[PDB]
Amino acid sequence: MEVIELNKCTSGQSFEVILKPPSDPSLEEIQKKLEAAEERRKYQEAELLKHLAE
Amino acid sequence: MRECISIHVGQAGVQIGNACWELYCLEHGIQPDGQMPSDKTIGGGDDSFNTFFSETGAGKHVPRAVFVDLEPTVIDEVRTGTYRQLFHPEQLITGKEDAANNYARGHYTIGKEIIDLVLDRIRKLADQCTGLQGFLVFHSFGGGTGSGFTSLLMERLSVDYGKKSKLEFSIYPAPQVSTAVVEPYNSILTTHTTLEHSDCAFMVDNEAIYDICRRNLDIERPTYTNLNRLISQIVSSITASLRFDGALNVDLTEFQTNLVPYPRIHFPLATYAPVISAEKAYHEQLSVAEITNACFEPANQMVKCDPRHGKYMACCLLYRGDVVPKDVNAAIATIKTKRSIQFVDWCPTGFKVGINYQPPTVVPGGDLAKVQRAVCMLSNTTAIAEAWARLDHKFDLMYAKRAFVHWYVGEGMEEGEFSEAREDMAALEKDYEEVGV
Amino acid sequence: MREIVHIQAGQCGNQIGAKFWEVISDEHGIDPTGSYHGDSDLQLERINVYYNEATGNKYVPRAILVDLEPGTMDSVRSGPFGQIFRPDNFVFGQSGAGNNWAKGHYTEGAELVDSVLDVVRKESESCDCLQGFQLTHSLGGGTGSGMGTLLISKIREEYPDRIMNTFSVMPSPKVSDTVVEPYNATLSVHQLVENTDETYCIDNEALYDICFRTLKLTTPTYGDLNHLVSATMSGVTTCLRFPGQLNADLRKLAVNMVPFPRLHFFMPGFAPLTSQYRALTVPELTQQMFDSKNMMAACDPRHGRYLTVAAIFRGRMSMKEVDEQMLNVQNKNSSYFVEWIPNNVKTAVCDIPPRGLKMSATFIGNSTAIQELFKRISEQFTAMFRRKAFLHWYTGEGMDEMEFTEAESNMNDLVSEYQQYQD
Amino acid sequence: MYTFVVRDENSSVYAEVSRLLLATGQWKRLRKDNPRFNLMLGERNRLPFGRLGHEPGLVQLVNYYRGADKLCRKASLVKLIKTSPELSESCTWFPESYVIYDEREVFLAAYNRRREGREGNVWIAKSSAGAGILISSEASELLDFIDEVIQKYLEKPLLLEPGHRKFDIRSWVLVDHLYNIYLYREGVLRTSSEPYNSAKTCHLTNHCIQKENYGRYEEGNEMFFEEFNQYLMDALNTTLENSILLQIKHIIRSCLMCIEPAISTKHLHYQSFQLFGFDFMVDEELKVWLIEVNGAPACAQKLYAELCQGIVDVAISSVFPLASIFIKLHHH
Ligand SMILES: Nc1nc2c(ncn2[C@@H]2O[C@H](COP(=O)(O)OP(=O)(O)OP(=O)(O)O)[C@@H](O)[C@H]2O)c(=O)[nH]1
Ligand SMILES: Nc1ncnc2c1ncn2[C@@H]1O[C@H](COP(=O)(O)OP(=O)(O)CP(=O)(O)O)[C@@H](O)[C@H]1O
Ligand SMILES: Nc1nc2c(ncn2[C@@H]2O[C@H](COP(=O)(O)OP(=O)(O)O)[C@@H](O)[C@H]2O)c(=O)[nH]1
Ligand SMILES: [Ca+2]
Ligand SMILES: [Ca+2]
Ligand SMILES: [Ca+2]
Numbered sequence A: 001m002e003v004i005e006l007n008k009c010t011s012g013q014s015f016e017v018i019l020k021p022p023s024d025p026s027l028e029e030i031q032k033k034l035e036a037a038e039e040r041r042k043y044q045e046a047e048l049l050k051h052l053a054e
Numbered sequence B: 001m002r003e004c005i006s007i008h009v010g011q012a013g014v015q016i017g018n019a020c021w022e023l024y025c026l027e028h029g030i031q032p033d034g035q036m037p038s039d040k041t042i043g044g045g046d047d048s049f050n051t052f053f054s055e056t057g058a059g060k061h062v063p064r065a066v067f068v069d070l071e072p073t074v075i076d077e078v079r080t081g082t083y084r085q086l087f088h089p090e091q092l093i094t095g096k097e098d099a100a101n102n103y104a105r106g107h108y109t110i111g112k113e114i115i116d117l118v119l120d121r122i123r124k125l126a127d128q129c130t131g132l133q134g135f136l137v138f139h140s141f142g143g144g145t146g147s148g149f150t151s152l153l154m155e156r157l158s159v160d161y162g163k164k165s166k167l168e169f170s171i172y173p174a175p176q177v178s179t180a181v182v183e184p185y186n187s188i189l190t191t192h193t194t195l196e197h198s199d200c201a202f203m204v205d206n207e208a209i210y211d212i213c214r215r216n217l218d219i220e221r222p223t224y225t226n227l228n229r230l231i232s233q234i235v236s237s238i239t240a241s242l243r244f245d246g247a248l249n250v251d252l253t254e255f256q257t258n259l260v261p262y263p264r265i266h267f268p269l270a271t272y273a274p275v276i277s278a279e280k281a282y283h284e285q286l287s288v289a290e291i292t293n294a295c296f297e298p299a300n301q302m303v304k305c306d307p308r309h310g311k312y313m314a315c316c317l318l319y320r321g322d323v324v325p326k327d328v329n330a331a332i333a334t335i336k337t338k339r340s341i342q343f344v345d346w347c348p349t350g351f352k353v354g355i356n357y358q359p360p361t362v363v364p365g366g367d368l369a370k371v372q373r374a375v376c377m378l379s380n381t382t383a384i385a386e387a388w389a390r391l392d393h394k395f396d397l398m399y400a401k402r403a404f405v406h407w408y409v410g411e412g413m414e415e416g417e418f419s420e421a422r423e424d425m426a427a428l429e430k431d432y433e434e435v436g437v
Numbered sequence C: 001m002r003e004i005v006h007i008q009a010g011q012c013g014n015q016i017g018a019k020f021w022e023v024i025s026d027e028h029g030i031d032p033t034g035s036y037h038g039d040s041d042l043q044l045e046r047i048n049v050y051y052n053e054a055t056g057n058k059y060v061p062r063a064i065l066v067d068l069e070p071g072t073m074d075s076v077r078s079g080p081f082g083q084i085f086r087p088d089n090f091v092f093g094q095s096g097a098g099n100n101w102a103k104g105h106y107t108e109g110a111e112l113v114d115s116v117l118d119v120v121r122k123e124s125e126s127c128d129c130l131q132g133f134q135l136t137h138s139l140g141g142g143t144g145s146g147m148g149t150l151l152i153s154k155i156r157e158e159y160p161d162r163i164m165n166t167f168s169v170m171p172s173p174k175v176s177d178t179v180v181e182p183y184n185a186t187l188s189v190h191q192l193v194e195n196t197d198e199t200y201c202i203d204n205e206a207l208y209d210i211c212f213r214t215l216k217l218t219t220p221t222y223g224d225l226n227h228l229v230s231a232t233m234s235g236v237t238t239c240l241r242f243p244g245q246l247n248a249d250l251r252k253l254a255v256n257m258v259p260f261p262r263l264h265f266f267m268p269g270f271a272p273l274t275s276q277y278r279a280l281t282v283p284e285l286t287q288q289m290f291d292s293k294n295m296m297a298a299c300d301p302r303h304g305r306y307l308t309v310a311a312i313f314r315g316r317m318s319m320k321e322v323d324e325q326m327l328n329v330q331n332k333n334s335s336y337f338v339e340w341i342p343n344n345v346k347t348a349v350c351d352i353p354p355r356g357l358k359m360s361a362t363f364i365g366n367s368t369a370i371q372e373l374f375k376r377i378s379e380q381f382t383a384m385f386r387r388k389a390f391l392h393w394y395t396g397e398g399m400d401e402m403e404f405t406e407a408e409s410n411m412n413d414l415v416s417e418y419q420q421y422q423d
Numbered sequence D: 001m002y003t004f005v006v007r008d009e010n011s012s013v014y015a016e017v018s019r020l021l022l023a024t025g026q027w028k029r030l031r032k033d034n035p036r037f038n039l040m041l042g043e044r045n046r047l048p049f050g051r052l053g054h055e056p057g058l059v060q061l062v063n064y065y066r067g068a069d070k071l072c073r074k075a076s077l078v079k080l081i082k083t084s085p086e087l088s089e090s091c092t093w094f095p096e097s098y099v100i101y102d103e104r105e106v107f108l109a110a111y112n113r114r115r116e117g118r119e120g121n122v123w124i125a126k127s128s129a130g131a132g133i134l135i136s137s138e139a140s141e142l143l144d145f146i147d148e149v150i151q152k153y154l155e156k157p158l159l160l161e162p163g164h165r166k167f168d169i170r171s172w173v174l175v176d177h178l179y180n181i182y183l184y185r186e187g188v189l190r191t192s193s194e195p196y197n198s199a200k201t202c203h204l205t206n207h208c209i210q211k212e213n214y215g216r217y218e219e220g221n222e223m224f225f226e227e228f229n230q231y232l233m234d235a236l237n238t239t240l241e242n243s244i245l246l247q248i249k250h251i252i253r254s255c256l257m258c259i260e261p262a263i264s265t266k267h268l269h270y271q272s273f274q275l276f277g278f279d280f281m282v283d284e285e286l287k288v289w290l291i292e293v294n295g296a297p298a299c300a301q302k303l304y305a306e307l308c309q310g311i312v313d314v315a316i317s318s319v320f321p322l323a324s325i326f327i328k329l330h331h332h
């Protein structure tokens, strides 16, 4: 039961009480994935309009 | 003094952000028109409250906040609300049509068309900062914007602000208030792509807030307003150290240092006490021992789970009110002999304690009664994995039949992202089981 | 400003569509001249979903009236709310379709479809953010069925990213005009499988049974049948017309209700159905709302399983008691809800009740029992088609027998797709 | 109309409990994977406690206590008794036990002081992966068996006459959702039909080992409390209550009150109950010893009807009321 690092100020205080000692993707790669999904949307719409044209 | 920028995404993020900034103004004595009579340095200053509020020459205290939603009706509540005078129009970003509870729609389809606009408005706030700490991101798991656009924003924030910390306040989906059947999908899709980009995330299960509002506030059918008033109290307890003088959790880095030893296990469990109904004309003020003991009752946790069947990696106690260290230690020694509090072998069994003497502020006319002292415990338990296990099970049930999957593929998402996201969650559950047993 | 463009086609579509606008104009406080005379801001908060605003604070329905005969649309213009419709939005021909799908879809209808699309374009151009379209029509005739599905296909081509929603009246030998209605319905259903996101299946067999058995009407009329459709159409659109959180627009409804793109045909239900001043309790609303006798599709829900369910309660009631009863119906009949879609029953509450009711309940169910409706149509189709009976009406318009054979195969596929998810 | 699910098809006890619930006409059984249940008769291994108590409008109850394995495992029980100050390791009613994979040096420590002081140095080894048990007086033989939990073998057991034969007492204990401890008034003595020879089958009193002289004295090597109490009066001039049953109730309360803070579902989003099987040994001095605790026990054939009904009375219907055979061990 040890209390360490007691810091006091006017608006309060803080401390630590111990009970027992122990025993990214780049901007390019993000734009590639976003443009890939947009192209897959464009392809699905082209297939629809081709189907509707038939 | 180092600044913090708050970002609120989707309906849940915006409405919760609205409730927090109202509470912040009441706590710092900031009037709705932006004026703050206690602030004597007019037009500037590097006080602790300046980490969240900038200052104009006219004396207005402007929140360092950005509101993003793909639908304008929720952010228009801010434009015409009580605190409309705080924000200037550059801080509020709306779209035409929302993401329709579809992660893929919010991340790929609509996110691509608005991500530059959001980042540019965030850049304007960062240019006002002499030393930006990082970002606090408020969002839901289940909404299409809150899940889809957030995970894109978190990726881009890691690109444009690589050295900055990022904290999350996430709303975990609960069917008693949820608005979509596919929310398990969106929750897992957004956890997968945000995991490597969030340093510390606080999950708030709507189920837990709902039952706390029914049980403790005697609200028969709690509304979002009831839920957001309570959530803003917890959020304020967590961010109070950034906005007031102190020594514990004084910058965003300290949250990771004090609560996240293993980076992937960055989901501290929050427990709050006491929650007293304002309709009670006179309630017995709970002692330090009583509110500290309540921190180990599942009924007061932001996520229902059993920390007894799990291990602790860290534990912070944030007291607000009439609290002295003597009463805290007396309460902890008593709790140790009555509670099952198993720490992991490679961490010290202890408690980092912070006390702010100002008692909690409640919204006048709200449902929460003013109390003389309150506490929020932040503990990293492996028991919070129970919430992942629930979420993953509901995912497995629908995905086995590919139910609703066509809505995501129709937005340009590949079916492989589902299984990829699910395998990540399976790895995450395995990490909790290794640490917890 | 999430606008919807309404289209009504054919005799049934325009008569049911007119009663729909008559009902929701009253609910929103709009008088027959387009002037608002209500007493609540809830009435105008989402008024732009279905109404445009003109000079003089006039509200003009965003409705387009289509038919190949002038007759029924002259009755609409002479009806109660006839003068509220935009006169340019009356698009009609003179030849009619003779209850012939081929005339509506291929010959007579193609001559008129372009001028309808011109009116659709003008409405959509003045939309802040068009959600999509709702169509009212029958599948048993020629204009609403043949030309309605042609309209839908051409609207999808020009607005491929907008939601298409239909109220589709299914024919029945109990309330039949001609014997070719199974032919017309089978041809239309395949169009709907491909080119709509949501279709409310309104079965004239169910509407007749409800009027006869429940409402105690020995000789039901189309007006009596359309009274049920008005109340149902008002109920299922409540979430679109009033502030709310659940299924507030057409796309979110589709995401909540449609787990598989082809299985998007809904069973609507309404409560109460009284033959009248007695106040109905919340348990009574919930039990009737799920009762087969309140279903508009003439399918037994106990013969199938619910994929998704949407329930809307209207009136001033206890939301706590609403949740208790909804949770009671599911927990007491959980075998009828599929287990591989968790929490697939969503509930909404709206304070404003319909006219003449203290409270009501509207049911929207995506049940696999709806295959019984398509089986019924498929049998009547096959009974004639195996002898090529009455096919000359269609081959005389340029159609080949192969197109009928393909429509037959497509609808049996639809039945099979429902059966595999029932297991 | 209450709903329940069955996830353990091999449970003889809860197969009867499920049968009784259906007979009441007020309980409906669902598919095993339906989550809209009031009651779960769950599986023995990997019960998903983390998915319980999250169904709105459903009071959910389960027939197992999460964490009770600490009491119902060989090595877990030994570690629990040693490390718990409530049991204090030096409790008189548990034989000196050691766990071996560790406590190898500690086991041989007290082993040397026994054979030197001419004391009885016979030990027994066992583990939770058995039907494989070895009994010997040489520690080298026992340790060679593990390399392919060692406790003191009670060399002076109480022997029933006529027969000069060993036995063990099984007590069924029901802990409800309020952590009331209910002791079933009926127990069984699983007796050995062979004379005890302290110089094979006469040492293990299991019902499967005796059946594999079986059934000579009593039916099925099972003596019930009425006959055993009568024998104690005629042979030892005492009663089952005084000589044995007071110690049994003491041991049951001690073990269950010790783990109560760890498994209690008092303020939990779901409630638990569990039927337990305590196994006791009686020595020639009428001292009761705890052997092990079974978390998934079977019942005696003559007692299935009474006990399974008692489970429905106090454990299930207490939470879900419809339209005493137990002794309540009171405690704090
Ligand atoms: N606690 C709380 N939860 C909310 C609130 N608003 C929405 N939610 C929850 O958030 C989830 C839905 O996500 P939303 O934030 O509403 O959706 P969104 O982020 O706006 O994205 P869209 O799909 O484009 O509308 C549901 O599970 C709701 O229960 C709120 O104000 N408070
Ligand atoms: N220390 C000891 N002294 C004397 N006998 C002992 C003993 N430890 C175990 N036994 C004998 O072993 C038997 C119990 O074995 P144990 O309970 O470990 O096996 P098991 O768990 O497979 C049977 P159960 O079905 O009751 O769980 C008893 O009949 C008892 O006679
Ligand atoms: N419910 C209802 N059904 C109708 C109405 N008018 C026609 N029908 C049905 O619609 C089918 C005939 O289609 P109809 O609309 O008259 O043909 P169209 O004008 O060429 O589209 C038959 O199944 C009729 O039972 C009506 O007012 N209400
Ligand atoms: Ca200042
Ligand atoms: Ca980073
Ligand atoms: Ca012509």
Ligand SMILES: [Mg+2]
Residues within 6 Å of the ligand: B010, B011, B071, B098, B143, B145
């Ligand atoms: Mg939204």
Ligand SMILES: [Mg+2]
Residues within 6 Å of the ligand: C011, C012, C141, C177
């Ligand atoms: Mg007609």
Ligand SMILES: [Mg+2]
Residues within 6 Å of the ligand: D292, D294
């Ligand atoms: Mg055993």
